[PDB]
């Protein structure tokens with residue numbers, strides 16, 4: 292009642308103001324915790340009432356932050372879990388609720404071991420004396436490289452990000468493990484692409500056609516990798532996979548304050564100028580060669596089947 | 610007279626039978642020596658008579674071996690030299706000493722082409738590089754073996770399937786310590802994902818920037834264009850020819866098929882058709898840069914060298 296509504300409002304305001312929390316795995320875990328706290332302290336007679344309640348709350352959760360699609364596709368996965376449970380129990384009040392609770396429990400067990408499965412399958416994608424290229428900062432590709440460097444010797448080129456240098460902390464965290472990290476700017480990508488053997492990156496949201504939104508500057512990196520025919524690796528978990536089509540809905544990129552690009556101490560020229568800072572960039576599926584998740588490797592021409600294994604087409608509008 | 614005739618006939622037979630001599634530089638030197646020897650002991654009143662005489666002997670020399678056009682383009686170079694000398698003397702008796710000193714300075718230019726390629730080789734090799742090379746030629750071997758004097762890099766040598774000529778190049782580069790790796794011509798696209806740039810040579814550069822070379826390098830250039838790696842053809846100026854590709858279908862030099870399928874195979878050698886082309890055709894769109902003794906040139910610039918070393922009248926010879 293009161294505790295649920297204040298936790299929902301604090302969740303909406305935390306998604307509205309900034310990045311709370313930092314990692315996406317803790318955000319997915321607190322989304323599962325919010326959904327289970329909602330379903331253990333509510334009353335429903337039919338499964339469609341719970342479906343409409345989760346739809347109404349998920350509309351507010353995507354209206355809080357449209358760029359953060361992790362809560363949206365997590366709500367959609369929970370909705371398809373509700374649909375599968377009602378289908379398997381239709382062909383149901385306490386047994387159904389216990390089945391949904393244990394399904395959310397085993398989903399949390401699956402969610403806790405995504406990074407360890409990606410690090411375990413990292414050994415069959417990295418060979419010795421290799422040139423690795425990574426843009427931005429994410430713990431998935433960092434655990435990938437720091438597990439592949441336990442038995443192999445190779446080189447990682449960590450490119451920073453031009454609005455805010457998020458690759459510097461990743462570079463000083465990888466160089467503590469001794470993987471010979473090379474740091475450069477965003478303008479040298481094609482200027483290093485003649486020597487890069489394989490590009491291994493992460494992403495923010497896997498779209499439905501195999502496309503992906505990610506940190507900005509990686510569409511250029513994927514274009515240079517397609518130009519130089521180097522294979523592209525996406526170390527992404529199974530909660531960054533969303534059915535939101537790119538050209539279907541608006542508000543694709545997340546535009547932030549232009550102070551990180553052009554500071555306020557520039558002068559009188561800040562009135563007659565128009566400075567934009569898109570923190571996210573769109574990459575088409577033809578520039579992607581391989582996705583790597585906890586269940587293994589998949590083609591970009593296979594992601595639809597994962598949709599057919601994780602999402603319902605009636606829940607795409609939410 | 611007699612000495613000229615027996616030397617010309619011995620040259621025709623040693624170009625008809627096999628590769629005599631071995632490298633292209635010494636046979637270009639002996640071709641220029643044959644041309645100066647056949648111009649010092651003849652009598653002519655007009656330059657057109659010597660033009661037709663050089664044309665007839667060049668027709669005989671290309672009829673000796675059509676795929677070996679170094680003698681043909683050197684005959685064409687001597688023809689353009691006597692053409693420009695008759696043009697600068699026309700606008701009458703001192704022409705012979707002019708052609709002798711022109712052939713002399715051409716031989717001085719031909720003696721110092723590989724050292725010029727080695728001098729300009731320093732701006733194309735960086736440290737900790739990988740290098741792919743197909744076939745065997747002394748130009749790219751000398752290139753790498755002096756570029757490794759100040760740089761540390763790697764050389765991938767892919768052997769040739771008709772004649773395994775990459776082996777002597779691998780053991781000649783490994784004596785200099787360039788960390789060369791020997792492989793077949795079969796994992797080229799299996800290794801093209803790591804090759805940074807490809808240093809090769811050629812046998813004959815055509816007029817449109819295309820080139821014939823040792824076989825398997827058209828596939829290698831297709832892989833280099835697929836991976837967008839720069840292709841560097843280290844070739845001198847006597848390997849430049851105006852012979853267009855679609856010209857009477859006598860492009861490839863077909864050799865005996867025992868190196869592909871031996872004679873001890875059995876009864877299946879009757880009902881099979883085994884071909885062995887030693888040369889292959891590479892279009893100019895798969896080439897990024899040519900390296901000659903005067904420097905580097907685009908494949909979209911070779912026509913100007915065709916306008917600077919040859920004349921369009923002498924293309925039929």
Ligand SMILES: O=C(COc1ccc(Cl)cc1)N[C@H]1CC[C@H](NC(=O)COc2ccc(Cl)cc2)CC1
Nearest residue numbers: 420421422446473483486737738739763790800803
């Ligand atoms: O040292 C580095 C660092 O890479 C970079 C670091 C920073 C930047 Cl900006 C650019 C590149 N990379 C090495 C990785 C092995 C490779 N190759 C070899 O050492 C051996 O070459 C071979 C040999 C055989 C085969 Cl089949 C393939 C490659 C050379 C370059």
